[PDB]
Amino acid sequence: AAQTNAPWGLARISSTSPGTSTYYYDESAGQGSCVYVIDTGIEASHPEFEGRAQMVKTYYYSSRDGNGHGTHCAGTVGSRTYGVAKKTQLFGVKVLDDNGSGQYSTIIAGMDFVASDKNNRNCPKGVVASLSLGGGYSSSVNSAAARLQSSGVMVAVAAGNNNADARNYSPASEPSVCTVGASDRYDRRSSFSNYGSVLDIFGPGTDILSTWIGGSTRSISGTSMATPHVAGLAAYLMTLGKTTAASACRYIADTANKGDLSNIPFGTVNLLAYNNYQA
Ligand SMILES: [Ca+2]
Ligand SMILES: [Ca+2]
């Protein structure tokens, strides 16, 4: 399938080269998979989600996304126009308040929630969790992410936006999950992207158009934007049967575009998420 005039990041994930504008993907499109977006929520009524999004948990007075960040990330995972996996099921877990902040204790509860809640859902092609969040190093946050992954969920987490080594941030620094850095449309490391040995992969993160609250759209930047490209890619590849929740991060690294990115510090992988879709 071909989506013309797609956001650059979608075009990039199905291309060997920068500078194109059409996204190519297998029409299965992540059908039968599920992606949990652990964030500020998801505006499920947005026409872009086509009834495929729902809120499943909140730790606050509402499950509404009063911020936009979670809705944007969910859009990159699975919206019809802005998403990688256009037929996946999206589940919102609101661990971040409407200012975009959340206590680590709440974030941990949210991860444990997903590990159990997947047993309440129909995801025959597998389960992914996208975590566009984080703060300073915490062994408890890392351990929660490790548990979620161990439980059979493909966990993708943001590397962070500190232009620093991700070793000092969580859940970025948890080795067993998929830690995602950000690139721009010219195949440069995004200016803010963290780096380091713990990164598994890069995805598009600068100037990413997606859904926003109030039935709108907007372009924003962050490792938060790169992460859902990888989460959606995992869901897509799992629906195709090419990989599994336990092996998807490795598979994505195996099949990535190699050596395309600039300003990657010595010791950080030069790997850009790629669907290897061949019609
Ligand atoms: Ca290339
Ligand atoms: Ca890893």
Return the CATH number of the domain spanning residue range 1-279.
3.40.50.200
Residue 157: strand pairing partners: 131, 179
Residue in the structure block whose two tokens are 């950000």: 182
33 is catalytic: no
* CA 169 to ligand 2 centroid distance, Å: 13
Which of 103, 88, 39, 45 has its CA nearest to residue 67? 39
Cα 10 to averaged position of ligand 1 atoms, centre (Å): 15
Residue 72 is among the residues annotated as catalytic for this protein: no
State yes or no: 7 annotated in a binding site: no
Q: Report the separation in Å between the CA atom of 63 and the middle of ligand 2, taken as the mean of its atom positions.
A: 30
How far away, in angstroms, is 191 Cα from ligand 1 center? 20
> Nearest ligand to the C-alpha of residue 181?
2
Domain layout of the chain by residue ranges = 1-279
Q: Which residue has the tokens 């799992």?
A: 238
Residue 175 assigned ligand-binding role? yes
Question: Phi, psi at residue 148, to the nearest 5°?
Answer: -60, -45
Q: Are 276 and 13 in contact (CB under 8 A)?
A: no
At 160, phi and psi to the nearest 5?
105, 160
Tell how far the Cα of 2 is from the centroid of ligand 2, in angstroms: 31
Method: X-ray
Catalytic-labelled residue, pool 39, 65, 98, 187? 39
d(CA 16, CA 28): 21
Closest ligand relative to 270 C-alpha: 1
Question: Annotated binding residue at 260?
Answer: yes
User: Is 16 annotated in some ligand binding site?
Assistant: yes
3-class SS of residue 28: coil
Pairing mode, strands 178-183 and 208-212 = unpaired
Q: Tell me the C-alpha distance between 256 and 279, whole Å.
A: 18
Catalytic annotation on 46? no
End-to-end CA distance of the chain: 8
Kindly report the CA angle at 31 between 15 and 222, in degrees rounded to 5?
A: 50
Outline where DSSP puts E strands in the chain.
Answer: 2-3, 23-24, 33-39, 53-58, 89-94, 126-131, 135-136, 153-158, 169-170, 178-183, 201-204, 208-212, 216-220, 257-258, 271-272
User: Distance between CA 180 and CA 222 in Å, rounded?
Assistant: 11
| CB contact set of 17 (below 8 Å; sequence gap of 6+) | none
Structure tokens at 153: 């969920």
Between helix 104-117 and helix 139-150 the angle, nearest 10°, is 10
Strand partners, 181: 202
Report whether 171 belongs to an annotated binding site: no
Closest CA to 221 of 69, 65, 36: 69
